[PDB]
Amino acid sequence: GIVKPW
Amino acid sequence: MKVGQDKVVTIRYTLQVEGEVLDQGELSYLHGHRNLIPGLEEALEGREEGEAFQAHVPAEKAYGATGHPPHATLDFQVEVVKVREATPEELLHGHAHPSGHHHHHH
Ligand SMILES: [Ca+2]
Ligand SMILES: [Ca+2]
Ligand SMILES: [Ca+2]
Ligand SMILES: [Ca+2]
Ligand SMILES: [Cl-]
Ligand code: NI
């Protein structure tokens, strides 16, 4: 999840 | 509806770094709450639902020197699939929720 981090 | 603060935005995307597809897919996010890569959100600002565009995000508007590669330019191909206003619950949680109702907290 690099675009929308956790 | 245009992408802007407190909109829940659904995007289809392909992410390339140095010409290699790293990740692609579809996701929804709450705009204006630092929930995306900063440079990407800036590129999405004001886009109309249905718009397709490319965005170059320099490492400084993303992962900088650490990366997650160092000093990489992120190459996004983006489709704005859906734009809607957030629910009160999404605004108070500060994130987008799945369409199905399910009251909860964190
Ligand atoms: Ca390609
Ligand atoms: Ca946030
Ligand atoms: Ca276009
Ligand atoms: Ca619509
Ligand atoms: Cl979100
Ligand atoms: Ni929640």
Author numbering:
A (entry chain B): 13 to 18
B (entry chain A): 1 to 68, 73 to 110
Sentences from the paper on this structure:
Peptidyl-prolyl isomerases (PPIases) catalyze cis/trans isomerization of peptidyl-prolyl bonds, which is often rate-limiting for protein folding. SlyD is a two-domain enzyme containing both a PPIase FK506-binding protein (FKBP) domain and an insert-in-flap (IF) chaperone domain. In order to improve our understanding of the mechanism of SlyD and of FKBPs in general, we set out to analyze the kinetics, energetics, and structural basis for substrate binding and inhibition of SlyD from Thermus thermophilus (TtSlyD) using 15-residue-long unmodified peptides, which we reasoned would be better mimics of natural unfolded protein substrates than the traditionally used 4-nitroanilide tetrapeptides. In total, we obtained five structures of TtSlyDFL and three of TtSlyDΔIF at a maximum resolution of up to 1.4 Å.
Finally, we also analyzed binding of the S2, S3, and mutated variants of the S2 peptide to a chimeric TtSlyD construct, in which the IF domain is replaced by the flap loop from human FKBP12 (henceforth abbreviated TtSlyDΔIF). Interestingly, peptides derived from S2 and S3 display a dual binding mode with both a high- and a low-affinity binding site. The highest affinities were obtained for the S2 peptide with KD1 = 0.161 μM and KD2 = 2.97 μM, followed by the S3 peptide with KD1 = 0.869 μM and KD2 = 22.94 μM. A comparison of the thermodynamic fingerprints of the S2 and S3 peptides revealed that the slightly lower affinity of the S3 peptide to the IF domain is caused by a reduction in binding enthalpy (which is partly compensated by entropy), while the weaker binding of the S3 peptide to the FKBP domain is due to entropic effects. The TtSlyDFL:T1 and TtSlyDΔIF:S3 structures both show alternative binding modes. The S3 peptide binds to TtSlyDΔIF by inserting a valine instead of a proline residue into the binding pocket, which supports the conclusion that in vitro binding to the FKBP domain does not strictly require the presence of proline residues. The peptide inserts a cis-proline residue into the hydrophobic binding pocket in all cases, except in the TtSlyDΔIF:S3 structure, where a trans-valine residue is inserted instead, thus further supporting the conclusion that proline residues are not essential for binding to the FKBP domain. The non-canonical binding modes agree well with the weaker affinities of these peptides, but it is unclear if they mimic any physiologically relevant interactions. As discussed further below, this variability is intimately connected with interactions between the side chain of Y63 and the peptides bound to the FKBP domain. The FKBP12 flap loop inserted into TtSlyDΔIF in place of the IF domain adopts essentially the same conformation as in full-length FKBP12 in the case of TtSlyDΔIF:FK506, while it is partially disordered in TtSlyDΔIF:S2-W23A and TtSlyDΔIF:S3.
